[PDB]
Amino acid sequence: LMEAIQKQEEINFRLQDYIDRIIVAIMETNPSILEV
Amino acid sequence: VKDCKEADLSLYNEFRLWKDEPTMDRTCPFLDKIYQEDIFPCLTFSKSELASAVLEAVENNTLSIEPVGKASAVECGGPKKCALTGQSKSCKHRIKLGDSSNYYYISPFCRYRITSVCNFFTYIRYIQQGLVKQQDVDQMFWEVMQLRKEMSLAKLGYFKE
Amino acid sequence: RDDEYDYLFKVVLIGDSGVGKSNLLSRFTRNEFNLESKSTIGVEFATRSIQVDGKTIKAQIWDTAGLERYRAITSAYYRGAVGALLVYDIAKHLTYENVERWLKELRDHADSNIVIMLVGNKSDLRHLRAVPTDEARAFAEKNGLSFIETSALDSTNVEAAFQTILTEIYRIVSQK
Ligand SMILES: Nc1nc2c(ncn2[C@@H]2O[C@H](COP(=O)(O)OP(=O)(O)NP(=O)(O)O)[C@@H](O)[C@H]2O)c(=O)[nH]1
Ligand SMILES: [Mg+2]
Known part of the structure; x- marks a missing residue:
């Protein structure tokens, strides 16, 4: 049961590292995207 | 011994019904029970005149509690003496009912009793103007039970500091 | 369609997670509040224009996750910010x-x-107050910060908060 949250935390790390990179990129070019 | 919880069906139905057509009227079944069983005993203090003012202030959301980083001590009380209960304790919080009449000193025990009631009204109000969307009825119910549990304990002199 | 604006100021929201940044944003920009609002993922901004000294100010309010240590995506966040609501x-x-x-x-x-x-946000919780206004206003005055208490929930001073920081930015940008 505890091996699922350890691997599920490595997944979150990966998703979040992705969101950071892409958001950084989006601002370096077309920040218009991040508007509500 | 294990710690469990089961909703009292009588209480559950009373609430689930009130949520569907929420009112702040003191005389409805839902609030009346809580008024008599929880609120009234909680807001019962030595100086009963000021106490009844606080009860009205709480219902109006006009009551406020500040910590303390020209008046006198007969009405307001002071740092070493609580205004609500005649007790002598270090008072680290002070109450304001206005529109402030005066700033009144409060013992930690009083603060716990009053906030417990203010928390109840606060959540109830959130529902009346709800404002409570993503929480299902079972969760909300058990929130009210929690809110009451706090008042039930403060009622009896069990508080947190 | 007149979408024109005379000045465009970028203002960033910073502060501890859960103080209500995202709701200050929604309150000012779309007059909406969310009691159940969750933690903010990624980075966003919404815009609103106001009149200051006859000139129209287009405000760009940026918001991001209140949890910040290792983000490193912060350089971009603060870049071009001429105002900050702490x-x-x-x-x-x-x-x-x-x-x-x-x-x-x-x-x-x-x-x-x-x-x-x-x-100071959540001024609507009157019985829970842990930070007396004077202590904050004092800290603000000595540290060269403006100060106001807002409630995203009942709306108090939210409007005022932005009108204030936006006009102070006007005066400094117009002068130089
Ligand atoms: N009573 C009250 N609650 C508020 C107020 N503003 C926000 N909240 C509540 O506080 C919680 C956090 O709000 P949120 O806007 O998400 O804060 P945040 O700073 O954006 N969080 P994050 O930094 O992680 O994105 C929510 O439950 C929200 O409803 C306010 O003025 N009054
Ligand atoms: Mg947020």
Whole structure:
């Protein structure tokens, strides 16, 4: 049961590292995207 | 011994019904029970005149509690003496009912009793103007039970500091 | 369609997680509040235009996750910010304590001359107040920050908060 949250935390790390990179990129070019 | 919880069906139905057509009227079944069983005993203090003012202030959301980083001590009380209960304790919080009449000193025990009631009204109000969307009825119910549990304990002199 | 604006000011929201940044944003920009609002993922901004000294100001309010240490995506966040709303929770003293740490990031990663306003939010919780107004206003005055208490929930001073920081930015940008 505890091996699922350890691997599920490595997944979150990966998703979040992705969101950071892409958001950084989006601002370096077309920040218009991040508007509500 | 294990710690469990089961909703009292009588209480559950009373609430689930009130949520569907929420009112702040003191005389409805839902609030009346809580008024008599929880609120009234909680807001019962030595100086009963000021106490009844606080009860009205709480219902109006006009009551406020500040910590303390020209008046006198007969009405307001002071740092070493609580205004609500005649007790002598270090008072680290002070109450304001206005529109402030005066700033009144409060013992930690009083603060716990009053906030417990203010928390109840606060959540109830959130529902009346709800404002409570993503929480299902079972969760909300058990929130009210929690809110009451706090008042039930403060009622009896069990508080947190 | 007249969408014109005379000045475009970027203002960033900073402060401890849960002080209500995202709701200050929604309250000002779309007059909406969410009691159940969740933690902010990624980075966003919404815009609103106002009149200041006859000139129209288009405000660009940026918001991001209140949890910040290792983000490194912060350089981009503060870049071009001419104003900052530094937010704490009146009812959680810890969030006021960390205001100093936030001033650090501003003095490190953000431009100087950036207008900084201290905002005490959740003024609507009257019985829970942990940070007396005077102590904050004092800290604000000595540290060169504006100060106001807002409630995203009942709307008090939210409008006022933005009108204030936006006009202080006007005066500095028009003068130089
Ligand atoms: N009573 C009250 N609650 C508020 C107020 N503003 C926000 N909240 C509540 O505080 C919680 C956090 O709000 P949120 O806007 O998400 O804060 P945040 O700073 O954006 N969080 P994050 O930094 O993690 O994105 C929510 O439950 C929200 O409803 C306010 O003015 N009054
Ligand atoms: Mg947020």
